[PDB]
Each structure stands twice: as structure tokens, then as C-alpha cells.
RNA sequence: AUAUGGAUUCUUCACGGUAACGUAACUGAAUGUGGAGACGUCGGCGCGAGCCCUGGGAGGAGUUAUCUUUUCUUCUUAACAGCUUAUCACCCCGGAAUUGGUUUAUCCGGAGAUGGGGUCUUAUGGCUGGAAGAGGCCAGCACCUUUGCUGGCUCCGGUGCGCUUGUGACGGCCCGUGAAAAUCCACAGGAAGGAAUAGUUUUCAUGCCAGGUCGUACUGAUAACCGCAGCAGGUCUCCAAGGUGAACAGCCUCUAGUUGAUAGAAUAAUGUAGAUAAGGGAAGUCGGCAAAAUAGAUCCGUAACUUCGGGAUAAGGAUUGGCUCUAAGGGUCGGACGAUCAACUUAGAACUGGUACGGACAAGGGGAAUCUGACUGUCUAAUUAAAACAUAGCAUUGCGAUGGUCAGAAAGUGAUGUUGACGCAAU
RNA sequence: UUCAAAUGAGAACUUUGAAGACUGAAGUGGGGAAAGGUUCCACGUCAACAGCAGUUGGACGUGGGUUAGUCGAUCCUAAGA
């Protein structure tokens, strides 16, 4: 039955003007402005959410330690484990194929 | 409170008291969701307890 | 505000350089919905945070009050 | 379960001023305290005693200070003392009868 | 408006300080021809137009 | 700006886990890369918060002619911090037809399902600190005191297709696929720098200093704005209780807020606004104009025509109160069932009042045809809402960029054009 | 809309108490945006204004009142200039 008001001078229901109702130690209801929820960081190769990375607004990442923003692996953070594995496999196999093709081309030049 | 107690006992629920449609008073989709959840809960309980096997469970799930 | 549970850590906090004031608060509570008992909260006022140590033993609380440093300004009750 | 609860009422001020009857009040409580929905069913459950200044009700079956206050106010209304005497609580389960604020006539 | 600019607030302050009747000692001066404030402004009669 | 503690190093720039990955830390210049900022609408389902409803107990108030263990009311917990908490997603083992798992909604699996064990995001919730010392509800002190002061309680539960709102995983839709930038972080790379009786690390903790300028009252409207006014007009948005009832409808109520608009005395005619009427039932009138009749919900039943989607609530019939019962529809735990808990839907049967039972409120009149415009939509603000305009579909014409259709006084000028015949332009 | 008291030279219209009603949470409630600019509040006070009245007032006279590292502007860019 207790009705509430905006605590700021914006009277419209915009994306930055969202409120929730909270009961205070004074025994009354009051509005409380809620910030926009954070979005999980995404992988650079597949676009999926990154496991083990904290979910914060972009300015808030400057306030936390390096543990909350990385994982202990190559490309930890920016890329996910499956994509890192796939690019490792691709790198090794393509380098081996390049060596094979160079040897084959040298043999073909010699025989031709 | 007295009127609510009478309604819980079953009074004042006749055709002369109904003013919305049957769907408006109680959604048939809500009824179906309750019933199907009950059936799936029972089938899962029987399969996990071992009272039925998985092939019979699959057939009864489809039915 | 932070809660501390290590007694040695509490003593180090009381002897920290920036620490000047502490508060002793007494509460009357019930243990497992039984007989009344006495709870003592020691609150050390740091520069950034206020540290609270909660002791449910009256004798240990009295011993800790006796063991508090003398230059620390203690506000009782 | 059935732990005995004791409620005390202090009628000393109206009794000394001579507008109250502790024996009549105790008899009214005996006659009108309900157990399991009926009056006169106080068999080995509720005991009401009085000694001229204190009325004691010891109960083991669903008795509350709110009910005791309700019955005392009913008795006060029946004796037409509702506008002058009220039922106050001093501590838990101990109560008294007090006169309302009266200015001297002068 | 509540959230106003300083230029507007300064003009409002000047108008507030101008809002007054004549001092009584003006009327006692020799050869005084000023008998009332002919430029008096009220909030519900003439709008300031910014 | 900086110091101490912590951490790391004689294997210099950490260890652990098969892995997903974890942590109090654990150097990093040029350059490149990635992410966040950063995004439509609708529908159902899940979860949270506030509100709604309700029980025991401790206080206060009201009623008490009769009755009511009664009716109302207080019993609260912010930002921030620590631990913990999840749908989705991912990792290890394993190798599936008698195909299995599974949502309200039918998708997934040898590109590795079911199953067992784990990892992570912390929306969100719980415990504790903040914090009872606050706030709330009561009782008791002396007084001309414009002055002071003491005691108690503030606890434990329950419920749901409930309302509002936030959010998650989804599904539907498009010839519509539904912002940018400041800013922040991370990765790749390793120019370099750095220890033995001594170094490193200010992305770990603690300690020190600072944060300027302008706005901030109040109304926001049947009297603070505009309409020459203290004008029945106009003017964007947030919060939102109980009953009846499908319902933010109508009617009544709690919190809060008003009681404003020149008044008094009589009750003629004529009016403005609202009603009733014997018998007949459109005989009135240019014309059924206006009123009346209908109306909610349940059941039976429903024609021509048709683009097969509709027509349709077609039409035409029966019922509706109260009371006392009966039957059906579930959850949580245990090994044919038992214990316990709880909600509102439907159907049926007796009895009973009646001149009335959607008892006020609320709320389609229906049908047979003709002309006309396909439909939804739009305009003459202040006399015309239509057959007028638009529309989708159809058709014709111009143009391959040194171009078509247009613009500019001119220009090293411009629109289509971030365009290219499935396009643009003119009809 | 009504009764009583107070104030006042004067009360249908001011104040307090006692009553009857209304808005009925899509309000006649609690806040704001645009706009207004002191209308906010106190004291004093009735010539003119409040289409009656007036001791009352958004009227008249004299003053008081708007405090930010965290709410906004300030910064960024949008169609555009
Ligand atoms: Mg419904
Ligand atoms: Mg359906
Ligand atoms: Mg303000
Ligand atoms: Mg305001
Ligand atoms: Mg105006
Ligand atoms: Mg004008
Ligand atoms: Mg007639
Ligand atoms: Mg005729
Ligand atoms: Mg005729
Ligand atoms: Mg028809
Ligand atoms: Mg048309
Ligand atoms: Mg017109
Ligand atoms: Mg017209
Ligand atoms: Mg046309
Ligand atoms: Mg009304
Ligand atoms: Mg009303
Ligand atoms: Mg006048
Ligand atoms: Mg005023
Ligand atoms: Mg003034
Ligand atoms: Zn990836």
C-alpha cells in the first residue's frame, strides 16, 4: 500500500532509470535504482561466453585483479579452450603439410 | 473471510454467479500443463524406482 | 565493515599504527532458542574499514578486554 | 506441549478505592473462561484464584493475555467501569487495573 | 524549470531585487514628482519573457 | 607519491588440476587482434523481489443491549563486505537399435546420447559483519519549567494459474533482421630490465593526500504553464490497497487528500435533464427521428452464399438464488499401500424462499434484399469521413554511369547514390 | 452541507472541535519533464483584486530559505550544424 517515487529527476521509464522496491531499517518502502546488468565476455573465434571470466561493466574491469579476467592458458581470456585447441591442431598440421609440400616440390623439380 | 469460507465449502459458484467464460475463469492450457507434468513426474518416478523398464517408459511417455 | 575471527589478527589490528579507537558492545541473545547468554562485539575503527570480532564467551571476552592495549581508546557499552 | 502458564492481575488500586470486587471478578473469570469452545469446561485445566489484591490464572490449555484482557474488559463493561478503569501490562503475563487520567475539580 | 542556467538565474535575481515599492523617504524630498513605482512587476501579471 | 607486510627468485619473472579450470599476488615497450559499451517486437513456461491473503505469541486501541478465546493495529533491517548459492555452457570415464533422453511448446545423440563424477558465469537467494547502539510499539517519572530522565517487547511460521516488476532458457515474425562514439579490459608479441648475501613484484593487503564551476525552494494545473483571466479547453511521464466481478470496467471501502463553485425562501406556466403509463401497436412522420426491446455466463442447436479461410454470438430454444451434501481432478516422504499437507475448478443429488435469482451495477436487437467501394488505413483543425485518396496485385515508358529523373547564380557544386535492371526514375 | 466555541466592529465563507459526505490507488494521493520565477515559509496586514462576502488568500508590506568527489550539466557521439 506504500507507494514510491523516483529518487532522481528523470521521470521516464528509460533503460538507465530502472528501480526496485526495498524495505529500509526505518520500516518504510523506498525505490532503489538498479544499474544495467553486465554481459559476459565472448570468444573471439566462436562468440560463446568465456568460462572463468568475471562478468562486469567495462569500467569495472579496471578495479579487479588479473585472476578475475584471465585463465591460465594461452589466449586465456580472449579465446576459449576448444578454439585454442583447434588452432593448435591446425597450426601443427599445416606446418607439417608445408614441409611435405616443399620436399615434394623439390623432388619434382629435380625429376623434371 | 466468511464469504471465502463459504466459497471453500462450495457455495456461490453456480451459473447465476459465473460471469466470465470457462477459459477466463480457468485456462485449459494451465489444466493441461498440470496434468502432463503429473504424468511425466509419475513416469520418471516409476522408471527410476524400477517399476517399469525404459522401453515401456518411452512408449508411455509418447502416449 | 569486515568481520574477523582470528584472535592474533585482532590483536595485530589493535596494535596497527592507524588504529586509535575501539568499541565494546554487549548483546543479550539466545543459544539454540534456550537460556539467555551474553555476547561481546569488539569493533576496531580502522582508516578504511571497521573490524568486528564476536565472542560468545563472557570469560574470554573479559580476558580479551584485559589484554587490550592501553593506548587504544575503548568505548564501553 | 502443556507447559503451565501463569497470568497475574493486580486489582489493588480499584479495590482500595472501593469500586471493584475481586471475588466477583474471579467468579466471572471462572464462569466465562472457555476451554475447547465451551464454558464451564475448566476440569483440571485452568485454575483461577484471588486473595484481595492479586488474581492468578494458571492454565495449561490455550489461554493468552489477549484473551484475559478481553474477558476483563467484558467484565468492566458489564459493571460499567469501562470508561474509567483499564487493563494494563507491567511485564510479561503480569497486569494491573488502572484508572484513567482524572484532573482534580478544584 | 528546476534545472536552470546561470544566465536565467542571474536575470531572476535582478528581477527579485527590483521587485519592491518606493522607499518612503523618496516622497519627502524637495520637488519630488515620483509617487509610485510605475515599473513594478508581479509573477502573475506580466511575464518576463526570459 | 610512496612504505611495510605478503608473494616470487641461486631452476630468476608462481604453483596445482588428466581436463574444464583454481588462487590474495605472480614484470612488460612498439605493434596487431578480440571482447565489453551495444541494442526489435510478440507468446507461453521457470525463478527472484515488493505488494496481496493467513496462523501462534507479546503489546495498544474499539465494541460489549445480546453474542463473538472478538475487530483493527506494531513486531522492520540500506549501501557496502566475507562465505556460500544457477539455468545455460564446458571437461573426464564410457560406447548406444529392443533407439534412448526430453520441454507446456519436439528437439538432441558415433561430429559421442543416456549414466556417473566434476568445472564455470554470481542475475538471484541464504548466513554473518554493517546492526540494534537505529527505527517501531507500550509502560512508568518532577514541573510555570522554552529544563531533564527510567524501564519492557521488538519473536516464530504458512500459502498461491494472485497483482506489479526484474530476469533466464526458449519459440513465432519480416522483400522490416531492428545506432554510433567516448571509455575499459584482455590476448598475441618480447624491445628490455631484474637476484646471492641479496633482488624483483604498487593488477595482493594495509598505510598517506586531494576532488573545482553551474543547477538544487515550490507548482506542475477546474487558481503557480499556454489560451488578453484564478477560462468546464490544451499540455510528456513513474508508484499504486480490500470486496464483487473475466477485468486498471461499473459500485462500495482503507491510507492520503478535499468538502471548493454567491446564498436564503417558495414550488405557477414554459423549459433543460431524467422516468412511468390502461386498451390498441407506427394508425404519427418526408422518413420508426427519438425511445423501447436485446444483452453476462452454461447447455442444445445454427441457413443461403463463399476466395473453403468465413458467414457465426447467424437464426431459434432451455437455465441461472440460497442451503445441506456427494464425486472427480494433487504435492512431500517411506518401502499392493501408508503418514502428512494444501488449492480452486467442474459435474451431480436432496431441501428451501419466490411476484424478481447476470435481482443494483454491468451489458449484441435480429432477419430478407438492392446499389456501391476489395479488405485494414487516410483528408477538408473550425459546416462535407464519402462512392473521394492510399493500398497490395496488374500494365506501360526511360536509363548500362561519357546515363535516366531532378537541383544550384556559379563553382574543383548537389539528391537518387553506403545505388546498378530481382535497380532507380515517370505514369 | 450542519452544530458549538474562539477571533473579530462585523462570520454562510477564518481557526479548532463535533457531525454528514466525496475523490475510491487509470485518485480530488505521493513525485517529476517542459514552462513559470519566489508563487515556497514566517511575521505584520485589508485601500484595490478573489464577478457574494471575507477577520482568509497564489492579494498588500517586511524578511527567511535552495549546502553534492558519488544526483544532473559538464564528457561522447546520433539525424544533423
Ligand atoms: Mg483468466
Ligand atoms: Mg489451447
Ligand atoms: Mg526539492
Ligand atoms: Mg515538488
Ligand atoms: Mg498564464
Ligand atoms: Mg500571450
Ligand atoms: Mg401504453
Ligand atoms: Mg403511415
Ligand atoms: Mg397521416
Ligand atoms: Mg448474415
Ligand atoms: Mg472502403
Ligand atoms: Mg470539417
Ligand atoms: Mg464531420
Ligand atoms: Mg480509388
Ligand atoms: Mg462516484
Ligand atoms: Mg464513494
Ligand atoms: Mg467580491
Ligand atoms: Mg502560502
Ligand atoms: Mg508576498
Ligand atoms: Zn571459441
Query: What contacts D87, CB < 8 A, 6 or more positions away?
Result: D9, D69, D72, D73, D76, D95, D96, D97
Name chain A's partners: 3 or more CB pairs within 8 A: none
Chain discontinuities in chain C, listed by preceding residue (C to N exceeding 2.5 Å): none
At residue E37, the 3 state secondary structure works out as coil
From the CA of C50 to the C1' of F199: give the distance in Å.
36
From the CA of A84 to the C1' of F200: give the distance in Å.
32
| Phi, psi angles (nearest 5°) of residue A18 | -95, 140
From the CA of B23 to the C1' of F373: give the distance in Å.
39
Residues D57, D42 contacting (CB under 8 angstroms): no
Ligand 8: centre distance to CA B49 (Å): 87
- Cα three-residue angle D72-D74-D78, rounded to 5 degrees: 115
Name chain E's partners: 3 or more CB pairs within 8 A: none
At residue A19, the 3 state secondary structure works out as strand
Alpha carbon distance A86, A44 (integer Å): 13
Sign of CA dihedral C16, C22, C28, C29: negative
Sign of CA dihedral D72, D75, D76, D82: positive
Q: Which residue has the cell 470508561?
A: D83
Alpha carbon distance C74, C68 (integer Å): 9
At residue D98, the 3 state secondary structure works out as strand
- Which cell numbers in the block locate residue B29? 492450457
Alpha carbon distance C64, A53 (integer Å): 43
Alpha carbon distance D20, A50 (integer Å): 82
Q: Where exactly are the structural domains of chain C? A: 1-77
Residues A17, A33 contacting (CB under 8 angstroms): yes
CA dihedral E7, E8, E10, E16 (to 10 degrees): 170
Strand G protein footprint, C-beta under 7 A: A 1, 3-6, 8-12; E 1-4, 8, 12, 15-16, 19-21, 41-44, 47-50
From the CA of A74 to the C1' of F420: give the distance in Å.
48
Shortest CA to C1' contact from A4: nucleotide: F239
Q: For chain D, where are the alpha helices, taking DSSP H only? A: 12-17, 22-32, 65-78
Nearest to D47 by CA among D97, D5, D93, D101: D5
SS3 track for chain C: CEEECCHHHHHHHHCCCCCCEEEEEEEEEECCCCCEEEEEEEEEECCCCEEEEEECCHHHHHHHHHHCCCCCEEEEC
Long-range contacts from D74-83, C-beta under 8 angstroms, 24+ separation: D74/D32, D75/D25, D75/D28, D75/D29, D78/D28, D79/D24, D81/D14, D81/D19, D81/D20
Q: Which residue has the cell 537460556?
A: C35
Q: How far is CA A85 from CA A56, A75, A82, A91, D45, in A?
A: 27, 10, 5, 10, 80
Q: Strand A18-23 to strand D46-50: parallel, antiparallel, or no bridges (unpaired)?
A: unpaired
* Half-sphere exposure for C17 (CA within 13 Å, toward CB): 0
Shortest CA to C1' contact from D80: nucleotide: F64
Q: Which residue has the cell 574477523?
A: C4
Would you give the DSSP letter of residue D18?
T
Nearest to C56 by CA among C77, C22, C30, C74: C30
Amino acid at each position: 500500500a506504500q507507494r514510491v517515487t523516483f529518487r532522481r529527476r528523470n521521470p521516464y521509464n528509460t533503460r538507465s532509470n530502472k528501480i526496485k522496491v526495498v524495505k529500509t531499517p526505518g520500516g518504510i518502502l523506498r525505490a532503489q535504482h538498479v544499474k544495467k546488468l553486465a554481459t559476459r565476455p565472448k570468444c573471439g573465434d566462436c562468440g560463446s561466453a568465456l568460462q572463468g571470466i568475471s562478468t562486469l561493466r567495462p569500467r569495472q574491469y579496471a578495479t579487479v585483479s588479473k585472476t578475475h579476467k584471465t585463465v591460465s592458458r594461452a589466449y586465456g581470456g580472449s579465446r576459449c579452450a576448444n578454439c585454442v585447441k583447434e588452432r593448435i591442431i591446425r597450426a601443427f598440421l599445416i606446418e607439417e603439410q608445408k614441409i611435405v609440400k616443399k620436399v615434394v616440390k623439390e623432388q619434382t623439380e629435380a625429376a623434371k | 473471510r466468511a464469504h471465502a469460507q463459504s466459497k471453500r465449502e462450495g457455495r456461490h459458484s453456480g451459473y447465476g454467479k459465473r460471469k466470465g467464460t470457462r477459459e477466463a475463469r480457468l485456462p485449459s492450457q494451465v489444466v493441461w500443463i498440470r496434468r502432463l507434468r503429473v504424468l511425466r513426474r509419475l513416469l520418471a518416478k516409476y522408471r527410476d524406482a524400477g517399476k517399469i523398464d525404459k522401453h515401456l517408459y518411452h512408449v508411455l511417455y509418447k502416449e | 565493515a569486515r568481520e574477523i575471527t582470528d584472535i592474533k589478527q585482532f590483536l595485530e589490528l589493535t596494535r596497527r599504527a592507524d588504529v586509535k579507537t575501539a568499541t565494546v558492545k554487549i548483546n543479550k541473545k539466545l543459544n539454540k532458542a534456550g537460556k539467555p547468554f551474553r555476547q561481546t562485539k569488539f569493533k576496531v575503527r580502522g582508516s578504511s574499514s571497521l573490524y568486528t570480532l564476536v565472542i560468545n564467551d563472557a570469560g574470554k571476552a573479559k580476558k580479551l578486554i584485559q589484554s587490550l592495549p592501553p593506548t587504544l581508546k575503548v568505548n564501553r557499552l | 506441549q502443556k507447559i503451565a502458564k501463569t497470568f497475574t492481575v493486580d486489582v489493588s488500586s480499584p479495590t482500595e478505592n472501593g469500586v471493584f470486587d475481586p471475588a466477583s471478578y474471579a467468579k466471572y473469570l471462572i464462569d466465562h473462561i472457555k476451554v475447547e469452545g465451551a464454558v464451564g469446561n475448566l476440569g483440571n485445566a485452568v485454575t483461577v484464584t484471588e486473595d484481595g489484591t492479586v488474581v492468578t490464572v494458571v492454565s495449561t490449555a490455550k489461554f493468552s493475555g489477549k484473551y484475559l484482557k478481553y474477558l476483563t474488559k467484558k467484565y468492566l463493561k458489564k459493571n460499567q467501569l469501562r470508561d474509567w478503569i483499564r487493563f494494563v501490562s507491567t511485564k510479561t503475563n503480569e497486569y494491573r487495573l488502572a484508572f484513567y487520567q482524572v484532573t482534580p475539580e478544584e | 524549470a528546476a534545472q536552470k542556467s546561470f544566465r536565467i538565474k542571474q536575470k531572476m535575481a535582478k528581477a527579485k531585487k527590483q521587485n519592491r515599492p518606493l522607499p518612503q523617504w523618496i516622497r519627502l524630498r524637495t520637488n519630488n514628482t515620483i509617487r509610485y513605482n510605475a515599473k513594478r512587476r508581479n509573477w502573475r501579471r506580466t511575464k518576463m519573457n526570459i
